[PDB]
Ligand binder design. Structure first.
Ligand SMILES: *[C@@H]1O[C@H](CO)[C@@H](O[C@@H]2O[C@H](CO)[C@@H](O)[C@H](O)[C@H]2NC(C)=O)[C@H](O)[C@H]1NC(C)=O
Ligand SMILES: *[C@@H]1O[C@H](CO)[C@@H](O[C@@H]2O[C@H](CO)[C@@H](O)[C@H](O)[C@H]2NC(C)=O)[C@H](O)[C@H]1NC(C)=O
Lengths: 122, 50
């Protein structure tokens, strides 16, 4: 449903938080404290230093496995996210061609070196 | 002293980047291990605006 981006991912320094809730999307750059295996039903704990937030319409809409492409890129604080959705008939990345519309840019202003995906158990 | 500032850091800053972490500074070949001392500078000092 989302990702965790950061250079430390250890609540010592800033680490953004993203989620595709069935109701919306929520991105907050706080000194979040997670657990060893964070998944939604509670993913975080003890939200500290909450400095930036964003909530809008959720990201992912709906035999064919749906493909969702994203380009996560950061320039001079402006973290750029691109959105794409495409149905795929039933693995292998589909050899073809398409483009990605931009979706949103946010001025988080953090140092990012690693990123870990937020996944659900089942 | 509501306002403070940084003067020592391992590397300079990035455009539109606000470095905020309170990490002890090592100015010498020896580490600091999170304890004040020689080559152990708290990253932030305060101005005496008088
Ligand atoms: C994040 O919140 C923490 C509180 O848990 C802040 O901690 C103190 O903040 C004051 C603000 O002037 C500092 O003087 C203290 O040295 C901080 N102490 C500790 C133990 O962190 C922290 O400053 C906040 N960070 C930001 C960027 O606002
Ligand atoms: C953002 O974080 C990265 C990861 O630590 C920094 O890259 C390191 O910088 C230190 C000096 O501060 C070097 O000693 C390391 O060799 C660098 N590589 C690593 C560990 O990734 C990067 O410098 C940080 N951004 C800025 C502007 O300093």
């Amino acid at each position: 449903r989302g990702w965790i981006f950061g250079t430390t991912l250890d609540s010592k320094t800033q680490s953004l938080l993203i989620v595709n809730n069935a109701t919306n999307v929520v991105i907050k750059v706080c000194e979040f404290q997670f657990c060893n295996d964070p998944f939604l039903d509670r993913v975080y704990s003890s939200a500290n230093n909450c400095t930036f937030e964003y909530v809008s319409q959720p990201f992912l809409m709906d035999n064919f496995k749906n493909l969702r492409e994203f380009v996560f890129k950061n320039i001079d604080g402006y973290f750029k996210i691109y959105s794409k959705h495409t149905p795929i008939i039933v693995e292998d990345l589909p050899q073809g061609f398409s483009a990605l519309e931009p979706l949103v840019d946010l001025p988080i202003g953090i140092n990012i070196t690693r990123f870990q995906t937020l996944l659900a158990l089942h | 002293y509501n306002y403070l500032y940084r003067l020592f850091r391992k590397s300079n800053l990035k455009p539109f980047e606000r470095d905020i972490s309170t990490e002890i500074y090592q100015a010498g070949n020896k580490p600091c291990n999170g304890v004040a001392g020689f080559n152990c500078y708290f990253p932030l000092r305060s101005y005496s605006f008088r």
